[PDB]
């Protein structure tokens, strides 16, 4: 109901609602790395059966899209994909009701503007860093010109393409946020269960779509 801030001053008024959520989801994601696969194997094991399928799926959705230079960007796909869809699990699923932070309201990392705009800016300047080495070092953002219709363009679109995927996740996290909160604000918990599975639908679907979305930006970035 309030998405603005936690009063965690750092000289320049940073939001802690991003901070603690990012910390906890990041921690669970990095700490599932050795549930049973601290000594991995060719023969798949406990955590291996989780992680390797994701890795192969990432290779599927990336090498087709990214291109010949698949390897320098295999972290880029997996981090954003796993982090975002597990954090959407934590945002639409993990409850924090009976204990409330006196400063702000915390359910999700991507709730606040800063989280998703940071991730989007990250992917887009990663596109530009890709174009740095992989395009003419004179013109990388403003290269193309047809019979002139595109004289200020090919950079005006990529000004807002970061803004594109940021707002893409903005509204979609605010979506499940509102859908979860409003029916509980209406009537006790047992009535919205028909559509809590609907709220879980897009929560589970965001994984592959954001993977192929920013991977499509990266496949554009090969050039």
């Amino acid at each position: 109901v309030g998405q603005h801030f936690y009063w965690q001053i750092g000289g320049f008024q940073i939001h802690g609602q991003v901070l603690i959520t990012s910390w906890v989801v990041i921690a669970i994601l990095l700490g599932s790395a050795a549930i049973a696969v601290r000594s991995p194997q060719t023969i798949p094991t406990g955590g291996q059966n989780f992680f390797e399928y994701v890795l192969e799926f990432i290779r599927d959705v990336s090498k087709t899209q990214i291109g010949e230079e698949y390897r320098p960007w295999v972290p880029f796909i997996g981090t954003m994909f796993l982090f975002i869809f597990v954090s959407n699990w934590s945002g639409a699923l993990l409850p924090w009701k009976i204990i409330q932070l006196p400063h702000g309201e915390l359910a999700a990392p991507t709730n606040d503007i800063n989280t998703t705009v940071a991730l989007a800016l990250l992917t887009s300047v990663a596109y530009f860093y890709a174009g740095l080495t992989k395009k003419g070092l004179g013109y990388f953002g403003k290269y193309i010109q047809p019979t002139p219709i595109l004289l200020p363009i090919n950079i005006l679109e990529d000004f807002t393409k970061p803004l594109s995927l940021s707002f893409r996740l903005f509204g979609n996290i605010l979506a499940d946020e509102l859908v979860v909160v409003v029916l509980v604000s209406l009537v006790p918990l047992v009535v919205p269960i028909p559509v809590m599975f609907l709220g879980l639908f897009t929560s589970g679907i965001q994984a592959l779509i954001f993977a192929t979305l920013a991977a499509a930006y990266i496949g554009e970035s090969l050039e």
Partner: peptide
């Protein structure tokens, strides 16, 4: 509210990206 909270969190997420990339993706 943009001012610099987004890159302040983005830097730590970048460090996560690279270190997690090592400790998981390389093995």
């Amino acid at each position: 509210d943009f001012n610099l909270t987004l890159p302040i969190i983005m830097a730590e997420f970048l460090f996560l990206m690279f270190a997690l990339d090592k400790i998981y993706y390389t093995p």
